[PDB]
């Protein structure tokens, strides 16, 4: 019990106090991983919400802090570092819905959604799917049919049925329909309706986590 060792123990306890203070501060913040195809329109969602491999967006809404990680700028194989993002609250996945007739992008977007949704690391993490570019789509359905991308589509050419059809084609791709739900929202230029839907989905995930913590679920 020397004098220097007691000062080292006191320094270690002060460091432990700072570690637990920073850990309890970091525990309440909600982390969201944003994914999607190249030039799908993720930057539009980023610019709409309030504000180098990963650029980190930190913003608050109704006293709940969100840290949003969009990693689409990095060009590398996803699966080898994707286990860094385990334990994430939600994955906001952006799909360019009006990109069907350009030759095709919808099919590798579905392959990317199958790779992310059926991944072994994200079996219990919810995925919030966003369908953007709504305004151009009816002007591209009136001139060009949807039968080119999917031959099985049999229906009248209108936004109201084709949008629900694309929603169901993305929603039924999951192989675990009981554990992880797919939340589909058509992003529009409303007064932060997007942020509201994200807050409701994060609220449902926090409810599920609290139910797992208590032991009811």
């Amino acid at each position: 019990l020397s004098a220097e060792d007691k000062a080292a123990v006191e320094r270690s306890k002060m460091i432990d106090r700072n570690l637990r203070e920073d850990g309890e501060k970091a525990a309440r913040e909600v982390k969201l991983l944003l994914l999607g195809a190249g030039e799908s329109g993720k930057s539009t969602i980023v610019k709409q919400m309030k504000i180098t491999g990963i650029v980190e967006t930190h913003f608050t809404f109704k006293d709940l802090h969100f840290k949003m990680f969009d990693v689409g700028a990095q060009r590398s194989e996803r699966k080898k570092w994707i286990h860094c993002f385990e334990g994430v609250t939600a994955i906001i996945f952006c799909v360019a819905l009006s990109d069907y007739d350009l030759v095709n992008r919808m099919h590798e977007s579905m392959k990317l959604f199958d790779s992310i949704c059926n991944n072994k690391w994200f079996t219990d993490t919810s995925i919030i799917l966003f369908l953007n570019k709504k305004d151009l789509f009816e002007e591209k359905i009136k001139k060009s049919p949807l039968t080119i991308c999917y031959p099985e589509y049999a229906g009248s050419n209108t936004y109201e049925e084709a949008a629900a059809y694309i929603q169901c084609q993305f929603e039924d791709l999951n192989k675990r329909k009981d554990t992880k739900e797919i939340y589909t929202h058509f992003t529009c230029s409303t007064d932060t309706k997007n942020v509201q839907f994200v807050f409701d989905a994060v609220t449902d995930v926090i409810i599920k986590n609290n139910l797992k913590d208590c032991g009811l679920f």
Partner: protein, 283 residues
């Protein structure tokens, strides 16, 4: 004659199964869970209050058969103190767990800040202090009275004798029956109404059975708490209002109601600890 042996066997069986369940919950909490989540602190508090409350039963059982208390005034004070103290501790522990699940489900943003082990430990200390606020004056007031043929372990009276005793019985009746059933029923009803709106349970057939399981667990907990704590308090109110004529049937009704009251202290570890999903994950 046969009824006395019957009720004595009833107290013995209830005491044994209550201590056995409490010791199993203590064994699992100490050696397996190691107190990680906040809920386990409340389960430890409930198990400790139920074990100390169930320990009062061998001292209470001999009082009927012998008719005398040949243990001294100090042990009489300790037994009456433990009897009221752990009862209030268990009841406010159940209220605190109901408020914990209410904050966890209905207020999700504030549940990240509030539901920490530090707040659970300080509310546990406040629970034991608030139960000690009733435990200590009843401990001081506990006395021993010599009848013409018996020794009685009972409370003493200050003048006027009816006012202080009836005020104590009505205060225990209100704070143990009216307020706790109201808090548990309102918080669990708002919890079920909030979970009914949740998309994670109100969708497909597979999640519907989980929602029904949660609603069934809530109804079983509330029904067991009401059916257990109703008859002995109703019988105390009936004796306070009107004098009851001595009968053989009411003598068995006494021990049956006391057994029903302790049965909840026995059954709360079974209903809470084992039925939780995390403890099943421990298996």
């Amino acid at each position: 004659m046969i009824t006395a042996i019957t009720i004595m066997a009833l107290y013995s069986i209830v005491c044994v199964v209550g201590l056995f369940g409490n010791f199993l919950v203590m064994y699992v909490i100490v050696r397996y869970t190691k107190m990680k989540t906040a809920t386990n602190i409340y389960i430890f508090n409930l198990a400790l209050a139920d074990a100390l409350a169930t320990s009062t039963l061998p001292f209470q059982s001999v009082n009927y058969l012998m008719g005398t208390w040949p243990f001294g005034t100090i042990l009489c004070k300790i037994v009456i103190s433990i009897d009221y103290y752990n009862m209030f501790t268990s009841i406010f522990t159940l209220c605190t767990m109901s408020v914990d699940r209410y904050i966890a489900v209905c207020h999700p943003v504030k549940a990240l800040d509030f539901r920490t082990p530090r707040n659970a430990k300080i509310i546990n200390v406040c629970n034991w202090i608030l139960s000690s606020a009733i435990g200590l004056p009843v401990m001081f007031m506990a006395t021993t009275k010599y009848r013409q043929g018996s020794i009685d372990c009972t409370l003493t009276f200050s003048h006027p004798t009816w006012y202080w005793e009836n005020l104590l019985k009505i205060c225990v009746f209100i704070f143990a029956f009216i307020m706790p059933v109201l808090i548990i029923t309102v918080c669990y009803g708002l919890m079920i109404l909030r979970l009914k709106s949740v998309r994670m349970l109100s969708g497909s057939k597979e999640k519907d059975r989980n929602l029904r399981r949660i609603t069934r667990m809530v109804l079983v907990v509330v029904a067991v708490f009401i059916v257990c704590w109703t008859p002995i308090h109703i019988y105390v109110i009936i004796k306070a209002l009107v004098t009851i004529p001595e009968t053989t049937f009411q003598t068995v009704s006494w021990h049956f109601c006391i057994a029903l009251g302790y049965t909840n202290s026995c059954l709360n570890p079974v209903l809470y600890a084992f039925l939780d999903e995390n403890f099943k994950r421990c298996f």
